[PDB]
Amino acid sequence: APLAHTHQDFQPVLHLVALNTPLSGGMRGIRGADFQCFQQARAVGLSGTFRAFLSSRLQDLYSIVRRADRGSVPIVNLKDEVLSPSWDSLFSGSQGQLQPGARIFSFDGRDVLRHPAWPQKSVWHGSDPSGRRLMESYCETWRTETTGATGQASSLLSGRLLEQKAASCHNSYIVLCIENSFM
Ligand SMILES: [Zn+2]
Ligand SMILES: [Zn+2]
């Protein structure tokens, strides 16, 4: 079964972990995506609060992490490898540029880029490079997988989380979960 991640606490960090399955724009709303993050996190023994890395109605992706934890707290993957020095650095205009060589793991320990369970190496986000929501491009608040509606997404092969591609909601992409505060 999935092995648990037991974080040796030292200094505050926030984990960025991918869901175990890709999802389409029809996620049953943000409530739907957040619940899967919460469930999969607990399954590997994490105690923090995980929320989907997505913008929603009246909610900018940028304000997902608690104010106090935004400017300094390092972002690390499941294996506690650093992806970013802080939350704010992703919204610096770098388009969420990750550390060269970095890798994103699912809650169950798989490298999303290397594993075939994720056919499409793209991440949904519904936001601009500032982390502001795109009301015209977030699959109607992640409630539809119809070909006609779009959701802003990013190619992971690029190394950046916030690239600006408007993709058809009828697509199976990677969805990330971010620990919203350190405790
Ligand atoms: Zn096992
Ligand atoms: Zn850890």
UniProtKB/Swiss-Prot annotation:
Organism: Mus musculus (Mouse)
Summary of the function given for this chain in its UniProt record: Potently inhibits endothelial cell proliferation and angiogenesis. May inhibit angiogenesis by binding to the heparan sulfate proteoglycans involved in growth factor signaling. Inhibits VEGFA isoform VEGF165-induced endothelial cell proliferation and migration. Seems to inhibit VEGFA-mediated signaling by blocking the interaction of VEGFA to its receptor KDR/VEGFR2. Modulates endothelial cell migration in an integrin-dependent manner implicating integrin ITGA5:ITGB1 and to a lesser extent ITGAV:ITGB3 and ITGAV:ITGB5.
Assembly notes: Monomeric. Interacts with KDR/VEGFR2. Interacts with the ITGA5:ITGB1 complex. Interacts with NID1, HSPG2, laminin-1:NID1 complex, FBLN1 and FBLN2.
Disulfide partners: 37-177, 139-169
Superkingdom, taxonomy of origin: Eukaryota
Name the record gives this protein: Endostatin
Binding-site residues, Zn(2+): 5, 7, 9, 15, 80
UniProt-annotated location(s): Secreted; Secreted, Extracellular space, Extracellular matrix, Basement membrane
